[model samples]
Target: SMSVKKPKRDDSKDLALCSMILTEMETHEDAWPFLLPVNLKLVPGYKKVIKKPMDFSTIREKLSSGQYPNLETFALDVRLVFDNCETFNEDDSDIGRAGHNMRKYFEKKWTDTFK
Candidate 1:
């Protein structure tokens, strides 16, 4: 729905991630399992990431559960905070504690619920 330019968390690996993706399909693991046994990163500057999701879901779910825990309250929380990263005014902003909260949430969800 929107386009924005931001710093790469690791710029050096950006092209490499793209290269590995293009050189072979395995980088697209979900779509590449059938085309296994390929390295897909032999040449440099051979690929480019034209589009992809800048996922903040880890940061997302955390901030969601926090300040609100139950499903309805959580959804309401997400609706308020999801696109309002700018609204967070805390020393541990930038989805900092939120990411940690999300990590704990997923850890509990997967560990307790699944296994």
Candidate 2:
């Protein structure tokens, strides 16, 4: 007997959508405040000492390896991180503000995915 792996979210499609979300996020000032840092340096793992993610390969190794399963699950995991932030859910924090925009960004693009 042969073992079969269940079907999962399309990898390329999911990558494209996740990439689109990141690109879209870069355009917003509020989102930028959270996605990027100031003289504190930039990019992931650079000055991210404030909050070190458990697994930082991000979407590259994990998602590509089927560790995330799908975009929805991946997004949920990201949201889980944001939700744990002390400032998250508060309208004032940069992380919170950007998180809102991130959610909105997904909402706006959810229908257009893989289209």
Candidate 3:
């Protein structure tokens, strides 16, 4: 089977919304740990475990550079940061909790904004 899907909405509008969501995510209280890329020196096994490390800063840069084709792609990078956090930290740990909180916030915003 072969199928192709394209967004009905304007790419520019989607990118604008992505920018807004990114700004909100960066400002969230629980966003500290995900603000930048995890330092390999500080996190010894980070590079080994996380095949694709993502962070808010990286997302922002990608968004600005027009790397994201649409909002869904942009959201994927955001979720990747949380996924990596979950893999590296325990659910009860501070960083882990922050990841959960941030993911909730993003998901809510995504629905409220898009739907």
Candidate 3 clashes between residue pairs 3 or more apart in a chain or in different chains: none
TM-score, prediction 2: 0.48
- Candidate 1, number of clashes: 2
- What local lDDT score does residue 66 receive in model 1, on the 0 to 100 scale? 49
Error of 1 at 9 (Å): 38
Model 1, position 30: C-alpha lDDT score: 28
TM-score of each candidate? 0.23, 0.48, 0.90
Better of 2 and 3 by lDDT: 3
Error of 3 at 63 (Å): 0.3
Model 1 residue 104 lDDT? 42
lDDT of 1 by residue, 1-115 (tens): 2577675443343333322322332232222212221223852322232111112332243433443333344333323332232232243654445534433443354344224
Candidate that scores best on TM-score: 3
Question: After aligning candidate 1 to the native by TM-score, how far in Å is the CA of 56 from where it should be?
Answer: 6.9
Question: Which should have the higher lDDT, number 1 or number 3?
Answer: 3
lDDT of 2 by residue, 1-115 (tens): 2687777655666766775664565465655444422233444433544354422235345555767766777666555434444332467766667667666665666656644
TM-score of 3: 0.90
lDDT of 2 at 113: 65
